Amino acid sequence: TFHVDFAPNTGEIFAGKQPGDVTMFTLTMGDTAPHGGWRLIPTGDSKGGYMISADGDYVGLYSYMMSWVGIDNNWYINDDSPKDIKDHLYVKAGTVLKPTTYKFTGRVEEYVFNDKQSTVINSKDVSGEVTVK
């Protein structure tokens, strides 16, 4: 019922100063069963909303669909609906990328609301690696 697909850009990205926004990873989340929302928690070396290169450089990522809350270490979206949500984790135009492989690790959490509080009903560890030349 609950499902999470997470994946590197299936395309090819090349290094240098990116002339447009570019998606590093796609993030798709959905459940028909009832629910209030979704959050992505960047774990490990990714804490803070980063991907990390094979060389050790940390590059910030943005979410198309979700709001970023620094003090909690998560992105979140409130959404009552049965449709897969498709989000892109991307870098902004102007971001300098290197010829290397970038890694992101996180945890997606599905929750439900109860008038005052939210409560986690499913959870999945996501992980991926995207290469550039």
From Swiss-Prot:
Induction details: Expressed inside macrophages under acidic pH and at 37 degrees Celsius.
Cellular compartments annotated: Fimbrium
Keyword Repeat: no
GO cellular component: pilus
Main location: other
Keywords (A to Z) from UniProt: Fimbrium, Signal, Virulence
UniProt subunit comment: Forms a homomer composed of subunits assembled in a large structure.
Functional note: Fibrillar structure, part of fimbriae, necessary for full virulence.
Protein's name in the database: pH 6 antigen
